[PDB]
Symmetry: none
Subunit: 37 residues, 10 copies
């Protein structure tokens, strides 16, 4: 009985919370997985 | 009985909290996974 | 019975909290995983 | 019974708290995992 | 029964707290894991 | 790792409550929104 | 690692409560929003 | 590592409460928002 | 390492409370927001 | 290392409270926001 697995990445938990009450703000990003702008 | 796994990264917990009451702010990022701008 | 795993990184807990009441601030970042700007 | 693991990094706990009431501040960073700017 | 692990870094606890009431401050960093600027 | 959390607003491992109410008296008048184990 | 947290607003390992109420008296009048184990 | 935290607003390992209330008297009048184990 | 923290606002390993209330008297009048183990 | 912290606002290893209240007297009038083990 061998698992025999060269790379294991069992879990990850990522929580992003962004809140903006912001006004009159302009910004170019190319990519935002989670962005508030 | 052998697990036999060359790389193991069992867990990670990442929590990002961003709050902005900010106004009149402009900024270019190329990438923000979690950004408030 | 052998686990036999060359690299082990069992856990990590990262908590980032950013709050900005800030106004009239402009800044270029290329990447912010968690940013408030 | 042998664990047999060449590198072990069992845990880490990182907590970053940034609060800014700051205004009229502009700064270029290239990367901020946790930044307030 | 042998653990047999060449490098062990069992734990670390890092807490960073940054608060800025600061205004009219501009600064370039390239990287801030935790920065307030 | 194993993390066990128990939250109880109120927990009792063991409890005994005894309430005894005797009324010997005619003509009491009362208004009660909620009476538990209550004698007028 | 194993982390155990118990939170209880109120915990009792063991409790005994005894309430005895005797009324010997005619003509009392009362208004009670909530009466538990209560004698008028 | 193993971390154990117990938080209890109120904890009792053991408690005994005895409340005895006797009324010998006619014509008392009362208003009580909450009466527990209470005799008018 | 093992870290044990107990926080209790109020802890009692053992407690005995005895409250005795006797009223011998007609015509008392009272307003009580909360009466526990209370005799008018 | 092992670190043990107990915090209790109030701790009692053992306590006995006895309250005795006798009223022999007609016509007392009172207003009490909270009466515990109290005789009017």
């Amino acid at each position: 009985f061998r698992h025999d697995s060269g790379y294991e990445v069992h879990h990850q938990k990522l929580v992003f919370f962004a809140e903006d009450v912001g006004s009159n703000k302009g910004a170019i990003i190319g990519l935002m997985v989670g962005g508030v702008v």
